[PDB]
């Protein structure tokens, strides 16, 4: 047994040495002379209300107008962000929903949670009511995140250390991603959807190729569990937030953390993160009910979206970057622009 | 100002809002009890009367009061990553077995350790606890030949059935670090399970009332 453990330690040392060898100059040094962004003040253009309990997840439609929000009162509400009208209200079989997703085509939504089942809801039915298209079972723990690739493929990470790519039409998982040490808390698809990154409670993140079915790279640097991930819009980098109260940015090819977003005032964990369309701004929701907008190139606390009473929970910028929605435990989603 | 289609959409949105309000007025009324305990403490036993790999919900109406009981012990995952979902539960039922003195690898101390965490979590400061101490008969029969000292460094004044039970209750209640904000209701079901549900109906009432007294400002 000891020989394989020594081999693993040797491989870890070798990869650490390679990463150090590649670290010629950090991003902060490279970004020294570029001018900072101004004080990013954002007003609450719309306050979406109607949810009765904590908002636990939300997602934007590709049209940048419709958005689905999931709450623990047992409701998925599809809102029209422009007018704040409820487009749909979907009751759930289990009110313990921890995540939700919007199909890129806009036809389907999905959700899951402590029931360990990913329920897919079809919105374009001829009956005129939203009905469960499929219930994906096979995970032995709560679902932490769900993301659509097509109308027939969904990738879901669970709290039993595994992720899975499913064929919705067949109803069974076609690929299973394993290798994490702790509960997989967050997941993010690449812009091209060929790769996706998962963050787990073991403080590590892992990059997976959806078709190859095996992790390609492992990223470390957080001292606590990771609660959120997002892809830098270019798809060559991703930012993660953790309970250690600092966000971090990694580049896939460099295979190490380029920058860190620690702060003095902030002493609490991060629940969600999102990059702005240009990628210059990184938005992150915190446990102290205020989202912070960071200059992703300089890590300056460029702005604060302080408008929530209870722990900030989820947020997302529209696919066209026109606005950012933040849902929080006080049962309100606020849209900022 | 608006198109006809926009006005119809607004009407539909307000219909959805009315439905949401109507369902919320129903969710608040329902009692929600989080069930917890050791692997074989008696959760199955109690569920078997209140019955009349994810979260297991069981619904039952007793004396025109609707209870949803969430048995989550089936989940083998990081507790601190999903426990906060149960902030608003009316109460936490906690099952512990009194025949656990001799089940060393000490399991009684494991039960007290779990009880400490449940009492003193950030989330459950205001959430009351209903402590079901089960299997009294297997403890009444056992105390006569296995003293409390086998598990605890110090025991009651004597290895007497009632004194031992009271001593166990006192220790379990003393783990409450927030006596000013929450109360622990204790039961001693000796397989007299017909009373169990009634107890939960009683204790829960004392919780519900003490919540309303807080909402209207009397407390």
């Amino acid at each position, epitope marked *: 047994l000891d020989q394989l453990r020594q081999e693993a330690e040797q491989l870890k040392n070798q990869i650490r040495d390679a990463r150090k060898a590649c670290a010629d100059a950090t991003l902060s040094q490279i970004t020294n002379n570029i001018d900072p962004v101004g004080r990013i003040q954002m007003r609450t253009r719309r306050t979406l209300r109607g949810h009765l309990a904590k908002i636990y997840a939300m997602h934007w439609g590709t049209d940048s*107008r*419709l958005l689905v929000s999931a709450s623990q009162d047992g409701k998925l509400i599809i809102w*029209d962000s422009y*007018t704040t*009208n409820k*487009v*749909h209200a979907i009751p759930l079989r289990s009110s313990w929903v921890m995540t939700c997703a919007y199909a890129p085509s*806009g036809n389907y939504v999905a959700c899951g949670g402590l029931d360990n089942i990913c329920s897919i809801y079809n919105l*374009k039915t*001829r*009956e*005129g*009511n939203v009905r469960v298209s499929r219930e994906l079972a096979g995970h032995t723990g709560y679902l932490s995140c769900c993301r659509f690739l097509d109308d027939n493929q969904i990738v879901t990470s669970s709290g039993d250390t595994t992720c899975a790519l499913w064929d919705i039409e067949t109803g069974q998982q076609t690929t299973t991603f394993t290798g994490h040490t702790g509960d997989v808390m967050s997941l993010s698809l690449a812009p091209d959807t060929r790769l996706f990154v998962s963050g787990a409670c073991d403080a590590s993140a892992k990059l997976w190729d959806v078709r190859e079915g095996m992790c390609r790279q492992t990223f470390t640097g957080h001292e606590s569990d990771i609660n959120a991930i997002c892809f830098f819009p270019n798809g060559n980098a991703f930012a993660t937030g953790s309970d250690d109260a600092t966000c971090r940015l990694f580049d896939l090819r460099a295979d190490q953390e380029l920058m860190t977003y620690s702060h003095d005032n902030i002493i609490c964990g991060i629940t969600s993160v999102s990059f702005s369309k240009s990628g210059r701004l990184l938005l992150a929701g915190y446990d102290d009910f205020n989202c912070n907008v960071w200059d992703a190139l300089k890590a300056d606390r460029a702005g604060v979206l302080a408008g929530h009473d209870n722990r900030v929970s989820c947020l997302g910028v529209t696919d066209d970057g026109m606005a950012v929605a933040t849902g929080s435990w006080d049962s309100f989603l606020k849209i900022w622009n | 100002t608006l*198109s*006809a*289609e*926009d*006005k*119809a*959409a607004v*009407e*539909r*949105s307000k*219909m959805i809002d009315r439905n949401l309000r109507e369902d919320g007025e129903k969710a608040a009324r329902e009692v929600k009890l989080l069930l917890l305990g050791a692997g074989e403490s008696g959760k199955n036993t109690i569920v078997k009367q209140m019955k009349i790999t994810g979260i297991v919900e069981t619904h039952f109406t007793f004396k025109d009061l609707h209870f949803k009981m969430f048995d989550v012990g089936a989940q083998r995952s990081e507790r601190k990553k999903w426990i906060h979902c149960f902030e608003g539960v009316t109460a936490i039922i906690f099952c512990v077995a009194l025949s656990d003195y001799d089940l060393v690898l000490n399991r009684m101390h494991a039960s007290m350790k779990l009880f400490d965490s449940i009492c003193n979590n950030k989330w459950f400061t205001d959430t009351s606890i209903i402590l079901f101490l089960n299997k009294k008969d297997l403890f009444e029969e056992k105390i006569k030949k296995s003293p409390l000292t086998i598990c605890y460094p110090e025991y009651a004044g004597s290895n007497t059935y009632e004194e031992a039970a009271a001593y166990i209750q006192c220790q379990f209640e003393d783990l409450n670090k927030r006596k000013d904000t929450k109360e622990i209701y204790t039961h001693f079901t000796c397989s007299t399970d017909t009373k169990n549900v009634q107890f939960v109906f009683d204790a829960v009432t004392d919780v519900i009332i003490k919540n309303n007294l807080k909402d209207c400002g009397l407390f």
Partner: single-chain antibody
């Protein structure tokens, strides 16, 4: 999905009657409903509308006060009471469902129709021609014009294109002037300039022949066109 009207037959001028249609195969409780009439030979004419939950009930000035629309969601039925009938009321009557929300497709489904034989400021919509000749495999366009610009401030151009084949109920082809309805082949397309619109068919196929009707949904007194006939 299925809509079936009943209560048809002959009626005496100036009397009263009930029509009803039974909704099936869909959540009638959530859909708004329309009654639309068609004189024996001439084009469609909007009769009445009831929004889901009966929160909104609108009538055409031609019938307002004489007709009354109602719905029974528990029985999934729609009713139309009529009093003081006149010769102008003799017509086929269709029930059309319509669900209104962002991206919805109102007027998608039409009932079979019930015949009622009576014994013996609005937006004006015009269509270019009463008839147009066509043959299979050809490309054919149909024009339309409106009294007011349908392009609303919110950017939606509220024009609808329906096709009625001889003997069948009208079917929604295009909604809001560019959006093809579900099940409509790619042959059909639509465009317009706010006040002038057009619908085009490529590789025209058999069974496409019939009457093409326009409709505006910018203002509640909905108005149809004269109908353009396409024949082999």
């Amino acid at each position: 999905v299925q809509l079936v009207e009943s209560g048809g037959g002959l009626v005496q001028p100036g009397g009263s009657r009930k029509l009803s249609c039974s909704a099936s195969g869909f959540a009638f409780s959530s859909f708004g409903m329309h009654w639309v009439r068609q004189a024996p030979e001439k084009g469609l004419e909007w009769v009445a509308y009831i929004s889901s939950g009966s929160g909104t009930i609108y009538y055409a000035d031609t019938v307002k006060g004489r007709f009354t629309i109602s719905r029974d969601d528990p029985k999934n039925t729609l009713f139309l009471q009529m009093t003081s009938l006149r010769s102008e009321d003799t017509a086929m009557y269709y029930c059309v469902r319509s669900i209104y929300y962002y991206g919805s497709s109102p007027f998608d489904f039409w009932g079979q129709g019930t015949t009622l034989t009576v014994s013996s400021s609005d937006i004006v919509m015009t269509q270019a021609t009463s008839s147009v000749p066509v043959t299979p495999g050809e490309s054919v366009s149909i024009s339309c014009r409106s009294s007011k610009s349908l392009l609303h401030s919110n950017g939606n151009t509220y024009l609808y294109w329906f096709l009625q084949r001889p003997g069948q109920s009208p079917q929604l082809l295009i909604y809001r002037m560019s959006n093809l309805a579900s099940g409509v082949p790619d042959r059909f397309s639509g465009s317009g300039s706010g006040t002038a619109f057009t619908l085009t068919i490529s590789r025209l196929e058999a069974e496409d022949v019939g009457v093409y009707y326009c409709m505006q949904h910018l203002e509640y007194p909905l108005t149809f066109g004269a109908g353009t006939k396409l024949e082999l």
